[PDB]
């Protein structure tokens, strides 16, 4: 499935050279295994955003959210919280009323961003306005991306 024959030359030097999901799941799993970032306990009782209108119902999601956010940060080098809230937005059935997209819950996002920042992965600056990716994180993400690419490929 994941492997298929290729008619052009792959580079395998970055996260931009490997599919989102495999990188995301493995990095999430690795992060939880290492135990760098907390659950945290209160986070199990709340929803990702109002378009869900239900429990998140998938256990390991917080690490996934962190993993996707980290990837988004390499993808787009300067962003803040609002960008995340907009990213993870989806559609909300309002019962009888029509659907609208509805923003993701900002505390859980704010907390993830803050934990990464504490661990040297991401950085609040004035030179570039919001959160950017920062150097220990940049190196780690790049290297982990190589480690995964080789491990998956053959």
């Amino acid at each position: 499935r994941l492997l298929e024959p290729v008619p052009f030359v792959k580079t395998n030097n970055c996260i931009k050279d490997v599919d989102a999901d495999l990188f995301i799941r493995s990095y999430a799993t690795h992060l939880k295994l290492h135990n760098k970032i907390t659950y945290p306990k209160w986070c199990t009782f709340v929803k990702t955003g109002k378009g869900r209108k239900l429990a998140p119902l998938n256990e390991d999601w917080y690490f996934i959210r962190a993993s996707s956010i980290l990837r988004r940060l390499y993808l787009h080098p300067d962003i803040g919280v609002g960008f995340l809230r907009r990213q993870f937005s989806s559609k909300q059935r309002r019962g009888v009323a029509p659907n609208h997209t509805s923003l993701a819950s900002g505390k859980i996002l704010r907390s993830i961003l803050q934990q990464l920042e504490n661990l040297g992965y991401v950085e609040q600056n004035p030179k570039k306005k919001g959160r950017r990716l920062t150097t220990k994180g940049e190196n780690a993400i790049n290297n982990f991306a190589r480690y995964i690419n080789k491990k998956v490929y053959n």
Partner: protein
């Protein structure tokens, strides 16, 4: 095994445990799910594999759930305006309380109580 009856029917047993738990009250599902996690009966299994001890634990968690980590805002039947303060009150007791509140409204009198006594909806449907 399968085909259980708890406080109310719960004959669910090929069915997943969490949805079986909903079948009492907490059909809103979040309340049932948080209680299931806190009780720590595992969502993976079918309801014919429930332990009696696990069911008792669920009743224990359900009873006054402020003392676990389940949030006060998340909790139903909150202020319940009186000198005291309340919690979600379950099943026939919940119905009894709702009925009690309607009885209080009829005595109290304001338009919602009066419409309710009469047999007419709360916000209006526009019956024209």
């Amino acid at each position: 095994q399968h085909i259980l009856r708890i406080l109310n029917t719960n004959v669910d047993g090929k069915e997943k445990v969490i949805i079986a738990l909903t079948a009492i009250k907490g059909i809103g599902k979040r309340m049932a799910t948080v209680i299931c996690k806190q009780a720590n009966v595992d969502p993976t299994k079918r309801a014919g594999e429930l332990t009696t001890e696990e069911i008792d634990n669920i009743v224990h968690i359900m009873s006054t759930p402020t003392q676990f980590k389940i949030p006060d805002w998340f909790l139903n039947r909150r202020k319940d305006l009186k000198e005291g303060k309340n919690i979600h009150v379950i099943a026939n007791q919940l119905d009894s309380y709702l009925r009690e509140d309607l009885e209080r409204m009829k005595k109290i009198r304001l338009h919602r109580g009066l419409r309710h006594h009469w047999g007419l909806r709360v916000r209006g449907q526009h019956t024209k």
